[PDB]
Amino acid sequence: KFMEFPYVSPTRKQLMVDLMSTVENRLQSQLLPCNLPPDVRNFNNPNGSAEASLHIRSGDKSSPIDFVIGSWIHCKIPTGVSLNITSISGFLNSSTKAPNFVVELIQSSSKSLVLILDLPHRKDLVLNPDYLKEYYQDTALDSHRQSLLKLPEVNPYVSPSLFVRSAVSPTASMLKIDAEEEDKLEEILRDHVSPAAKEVLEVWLERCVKEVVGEEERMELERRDKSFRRKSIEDDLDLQFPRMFGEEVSSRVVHAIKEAFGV
Template structure:
């Protein structure tokens, strides 16, 4: 998951910028990070859909598509996206063969839970791999952090953009929504690339839909490196429904986030994943170098520094090893 980003350096002040999380290279957020994933659970847990188990003995096996800690509209969106991607790319993907303790993992205290999902593409496919993850962590403030992510990466046989969606929720009224088809070539140097994937597809119209919502503000990553990787039509917003009435966040997810995300995935599947583009040997070398640099940087600045803080060295080492294999495979 070249786009993986797990929370690091989070501020307790929720008015500051969220910083990136979970397995897409895209952010560096500043939501509250648990000071220790191994301390006692918060006495005031606040979870969006279902309660976390109080001890490891109560924990039953979970899988990526369960999305057990988020609201129904959030869960339904993620399940539909995964199902759509798998159904369209089924013949191009190998089964998920991750060990059970990587597909679902949690800290001894039960304060942090996570799931990882990876399906590699067949050698004849343009798809490098599909990666999904979710993370649930109790916060020192008494709330909970929930991150759900789905991304797909193409190999050097095509120069088409990748796909990324990530939802980062730190309270029932605060959510950061990231959606992008990150470019794999410089749109300035290759104007045909800009026109084909970002102008002709009208991705900009999807981004503009959120400008009409009073609860929406732009989200800006504090990491300049991350900003260099996004497309000109990327959706990076913060949704704040405090004072807007109970259920408003779920309404926005269902009526606005859901249709936009599904349309973006449809565009990516039809115009990128399933459309053949001819790439010469020089182009393949360029893509392999660029993709490799981004993957390594993702692990260096996001995952490698943050994941051990959330899950401890043993769990983090086990999961990071699998991620590195996917990135470098």
């Protein structure tokens, strides 16, 4: 209940469905059932300006997964133009050093789209070049970024947030797709974005999830993981959610998210 993705195109919808199904299927034996209140799994603004749905599976202890979060947001800006955000993120706990996973599509017009697809690092890459070799050089991650760039309507996306720029790995696909034809953008999605996203997901599941972390290393992991979670919720939710949904709906959803993220 979330898998409806009602406000987006079928191609995008199918991609989000493929990805969420793959995650839930491959990690079933390590994923708890969703425990969010129903008034947090699906919520909206009293005035009808915004609608969202949230799906969070916590991971078992003795397992490497902290949680998995899937979401969609639909928000009709007073102008009449609707903002549609869809995302799947995978967070690993401090029992492993391996990278997280994120896919996010952010679309305002029929022809323009921001893609964020990455396996965010959980160790300092400069202190730990061995980590960099292990999870990014040895894998084929950079090729997805590169292959997507070839396309004439795909250009680099440079976040206005310096924090988001620093939190993604050096292989991250941060892309702005500007296909001035709805037909072309959807063609980009199924032929290009979709195989990229599915392939990035596969290396996360086999190379990061599947497989001891030292006392001070785990403490470092938790500290950095917590810093990431705390800062991003402050930037992304603590002003945009009260605005999109009202202060009633936000406070309870934000609290539920904070609790889930352990912040």
